[model samples]
Target: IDDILQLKDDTGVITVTADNYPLLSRGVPGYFNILYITMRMSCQLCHDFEKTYHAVADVIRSQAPQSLNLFFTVDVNEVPQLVKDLKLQNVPHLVVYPPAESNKQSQFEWKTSPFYQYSLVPENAENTLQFGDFLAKILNISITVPQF
Candidate 1:
């Protein structure tokens, strides 16, 4: 298992990376990790829609503080191991891990294909608020973020 770097922010979006790869795969003590797999922060695609990403996390944490879910992101460049471990061939994947203790990692916990087929085009980004709103409606989180 990988070590958790405790890179959580006040707003709730956790910087999921090599230092904390296990945090996303193994889940926190009482929280289910919602790993939003994105690329580099300096990348143009990332810069364009990053705020919406943060805003979504904000809404989650606010609307459903009682939920056992936490949001996070991993930069493939910074965390190559995570990419390989997750067997990711594309960016912008959404992976979820349960709060249970288990060695059966990968998307056994549940994951999504690269949103908008990020492989086909890096600029094809999802609407952050709509994505957030969609999450809110589905998970009933209406609420969260974490990081390093």
Candidate 2:
């Protein structure tokens, strides 16, 4: 968790940046493990920037620690370069980057869905917690993020 929060500090090498959609930038580092993202194309769906960002902000606010160190970015291009750079393949994406070492870029070995498959909503507490547990098992880390 400490490692994740360090990404938010200006001194950190791995910075999360958003393009095209600025509204999603607000309150991002407060909820996620690393970065959260949305595309510019989806921004107007919720009336205006305020409504659009607030909805996600509320989710982050409502769930802290579990949601801490998270942030949002908007990339209108949906280009493979950014995704490949981030090593992400999905939208409303969540990425967890490993700490930087030897002047090299941080590495991200795991990336997952932005929303529930059957429903458009983000994955529920049950699923997120389960996923976290799976991550812990795979990484062999004792740290665990609570579901709800």
Candidate 3:
């Protein structure tokens, strides 16, 4: 393990710029990892996604999906940092990082290469149910997120 990723398991949310994000070299132990990225001080969602994110965690834990673990982060709390450095062009991006076992590091050139990232775009950030449902659907697990 070359990098140590810090995570807030309470709500399964972690700061995107939290030094160990993108957990490339050695990923957080899990089969499926969900990353919900939001912007606190910016973006058009009014930054009202805190509740939904937590709701997702609650629902997921209640059902106890086999090897699935959900995590979250943000776009920008104010401005420029890892978000800019990483060139993320979307708001409220639900990045999905599958388990990686190979000893390798990610690169920007991986946008289409063998190491591109995957994400789910939510139509509304306020609906925690949708987030959990979407995740459970792809993962084939049963769960429900609490509303607002």
Candidate 4:
């Protein structure tokens, strides 16, 4: 469990830039895409959330289906356009893009509504287990975050 919690940062999380967002926004062929935007330069909260994000991603990478979802992280500096495009007013934001293919369907309204973006609070940002549980509820899969 400690080893799982201490996994490295190569858990299939793709780092995307503004130049290629158009192609990525079109979807990753046949997978659900998670758009995670953060400011690596300053945001102190993002500093805390970053670890939790990696932990959740590591769990998903190990436990989730191979093609069900893909995680993409965008630096706000790299993709400033996303702040306007995603209509974000905060430092860190998270959104999910459903697959164009007919493989999986989301039962949550967040998929269609922009007003329901992933709720990012200081507590949730620091709580790896809470973050994983939230994703588990939405993705309908078991995302176990090792307690340490």
- Select the stronger candidate by lDDT from 1 and 4: 4
lDDT of 1 by residue, 91-143 (tens): 65655554544443333332332222222223434465456655665455643
Q: What is candidate 4's lDDT per residue for 7-108, written digit by digit as tens?
A: 223676777667766545555444566767788833877787888888787888788855366677878788766666676677787676655544433322
How big is the positional error of residue 20 in model 3, measured in Å on the Cα after superposition? 1.9
How would you encode candidate 3's per-residue C-alpha lDDT over 11-90 as one tens digit per residue? 54555454444342134544445555566533545365566666776777677646455454655553345455446666
Off by over 4 Å in 4: 1-9, 101-116
Please give the range of 10 consecutive residues that has the lowest summed lDDT in model 4: 107-116
Worst 10 residues of 1 by lDDT: 112-121
Candidate 2: give the clashing pairs: 28-70, 28-71, 31-67, 31-70, 32-69, 32-70, 36-71
Task: Give the TM-scores of the predictions, in the order they appear.
Answer: 0.65, 0.32, 0.64, 0.76
What are the lDDT figures for the candidates, one per model?
0.58, 0.36, 0.52, 0.65
Candidate 2 lDDT over residue span 1-148, tens digit each? 4553454433222344434222222223223233434454333331233232333333333433343334433352544445664564545543433323323322212232232121113323224444444334333344434334
lDDT at 39, model 4: 84
Candidate 3 pairs with clashing backbones = none
Clashes of each: 16, 7, 0, 0
Candidate 1 segments exceeding 4 Å error:
1-7, 98-126, 142-148
Which ranking of candidates, highest TM-score first?
4, 1, 3, 2
Ranking by lDDT: 4, 1, 3, 2
